[PDB]
Paper text:
Overcoming lysogenization defect (OLD) proteins constitute a family of uncharacterized nucleases present in bacteria, archaea, and some viruses. These enzymes contain an N-terminal ATPase domain and a C-terminal Toprim domain common amongst replication, recombination, and repair proteins.
Crystals of the analogous BpCTR construct diffracted to a slightly lower resolution (2.2–2.3 Å) but produced a more complete structural model (residues 390–594). BpCTR contains two domains: a Toprim domain (residues 390–504, purple) and a unique helical domain (residues 505–594, yellow) consisting of a five-helix orthogonal bundle and an additional C-terminal amphipathic helix (α6H). α6H extends into a groove along one face of the Toprim's central β-sheet, forming extensive hydrophobic interactions. BpCTR crystallized in a different space group thereby permitting the helical domain to rotate and scrunch closer to the Toprim domain. Each magnesium is octahedrally coordinated with a water molecule bridging the two metals where the scissile phosphate would normally sit. The conserved Toprim glutamate (E400) and the first aspartate of the DxD motif (D455) each provide a ligand to the first magnesium (metal A). Mutant combinations of either the metal A or the metal B interacting residues together completely abolish Bp OLD nuclease activity on linear DNA substrates in vitro.
Author numbering:
A (entry chain B), D (entry chain B): 391 to 594
B (entry chain A), C (entry chain A): 391 to 481, 488 to 594
The structure:
């Protein structure tokens, strides 16, 4: 490392896609010395310590999935309180029932989506490209292709878990490398765009 | 397991500078799926075998330094012939333009004089003066080099650069990358590998 | 997340040669949990802050080159003072022996002349002659350097080594590592970090 | 890479332990230019192609777990036939009902243990050190400590899956880094020693 800035992401899907969207947005990560570091999981806290104010004091952002669970809080709320514990001033406000630490997280460069990466891509308008990739990569049934056509016509009808099943057949990392070809500024999910603008400005 | 194209480079400086110049030229390596691969030396031949026609037939380019030698042919001559032997059709001051046809690009000296000739001399001086503690003498040497790039003393520049580390130096210098300071041989290799992947 | 000790080195050559010399001295870095960490340059100070008393207080050593300069103090002087400032108790041609007390080891020139002085000259010549295409003149230069290490021409050795790549060169040279060709400053740093981890 | 030789292993446990046993055995991997490469899984076939006779032709070995399953063949038998397909001359013998491809695998540098790494370490005589590490790292019950004392007195009584549960509480990679301190030539499992001698000789 010893980048001028770091984008911490969960996996290799993000590692392919984030630099592709940055290119689409004309945000120059290589000129600015910004690196994308996958933690191969959801445990950013060891990296935050090493890199945060106590450590090397390197500008950084975190991109992570909300991971909503049925009849339970989103997995990301607790994972975000842990990162905030290592980075926030010792005032300890309510954070809106401490289940709304999101806004304070964004001030510190921690960005959470509304579900998980691949449904967010579909909802951000990449549905046609995701369908192209899945039908080029997999051997598919007519039932699958028609489910994908329907989701493209109405992304609100999208079944997230059947989508990820399809993608896990491809491999999330291989899927994302193929989807990177389709990145445009208008199909970048908001949380990725926010994080790229944040880290560009932190470094500059 | 696969990339749409590969840019082969010699070392850490190109690893950091080629992606910066690609951004300054608006060439989207990550969207095109083009990666930059350093061979940490000057022997590209094993890699060209893996990914060339012999093997995976992945589109690729090579960036290498001429390495001109006093009273000898420059070192890149035999280096290119060796790569051409493994890539070309049936048929030295000869192989340069044929090499470029196959994505093999040689500069006219070595990376760092080329950057000075291309207009990055002010950036190189800024990087060196802000990262190192320097004597007035080296700072005046750098001022001469900027106002006349032909005056460049390469033993001295490289010693300065090795104090920083070639990769650290290049990462700092990337922040000054622009389209008008991109050496021709890098710009041509980048346009070539973008055309190729298309 | 943690190692029992760290050996900080400047670059790729030490990355490959320090573990080879440790094997030739029967110092078991993997059993002791000691890792070798290259800083890719000459600025050790940020790392010493992370792992020194200021931070994790992991036992560590530093291997760095003197970098002697004509009509100046050698570059390592200020470099060591900067690291000593961050490591030492309250109180230049001074700081060397105090530096060694804290695991900071400086050679007398730079790695590669030191290897020649220590007896590895025949290996360096073998590596260079078998990996490069060479002129008779460079092969006679290497023969002079082997029979008299004081005659060594460092501009020329380094140019040869950069044709190979410093890390490739050092990995090939590792195969010749022995206890009797290990420079003193490497041997002392290795014994020091083994004592420290115990 | 571009090592003179490669030891392909499954995970980071092996990545810590193999070089420790090599030191204990006075097999000089750094002098010989031999590297230990974790594939973070059990899928060596992509690496074998890149590195084998068709690829860079680099001397290499594979260390992998038998992975015995109850009422089923060992998982390693099929995983080994796949690697052998990419490396063996096209004679295609019986391999002893093709469920005994082990001997031919060892000729090609593919070494399989009898269960999985951590029980094999216990059985090779490291049981006392494994007990030390577990009781230093974990908070343990008296029931656990007495089960470990019993296994140390008679490794044949060892319960493999309770051992790995204990170790998975520590983290297999962190466990192995701590166990490396205990490596000796006499506690090296045979399959690791065989592989180290093979790759040392292939390189020399
Ligand atoms: Mg880019
Ligand atoms: Mg996730
Ligand atoms: Mg648009
Ligand atoms: Mg642009
Ligand atoms: Mg060069
Ligand atoms: Mg260079
Ligand atoms: Mg020994
Ligand atoms: Mg040096
Ligand atoms: Mg050196
Ligand atoms: Mg060793
Ligand atoms: Mg296993
Ligand atoms: Mg013994």
């Amino acid at each position: 490392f010893f980048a001028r800035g770091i984008i911490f992401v969960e996996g290799d899907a993000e590692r392919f896609l984030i630099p592709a969207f940055a290119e689409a947005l004309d945000i120059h990560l290589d000129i600015l010395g910004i690196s994308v570091c996958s933690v191969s999981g959801t445990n950013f806290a060891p990296y935050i310590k090493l890199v945060g104010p106590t450590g090397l004091n390197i500008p950084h952002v975190v991109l992570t999935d909300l991971d909503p669970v049925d009849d339970r809080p989103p997995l990301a709320r607790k994972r975000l309180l842990r990162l905030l514990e290592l980075a926030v001033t010792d005032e300890e406000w309510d954070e809106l029932d401490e289940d709304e630490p999101w806004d304070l997280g964004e001030e510190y460069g921690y960005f959470v989506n509304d579900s998980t990466l691949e449904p967010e891509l579909f909802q951000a308008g990449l549905g046609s490209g995701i369908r192209d990739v899945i039908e080029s990569e997999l051997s598919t049934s007519a039932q699958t292709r028609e489910a994908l056509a329907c989701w493209v016509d109405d992304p609100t009808a999208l079944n997230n878990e059947r989508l990820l099943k399809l993608i896990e057949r491809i491999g999330k990392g291989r899927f994302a490398q193929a989807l990177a070809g389709f990145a445009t500024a208008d199909t970048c999910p908001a949380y990725i765009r926010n994080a790229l603008e944040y880290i560009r400005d932190a470094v500059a």
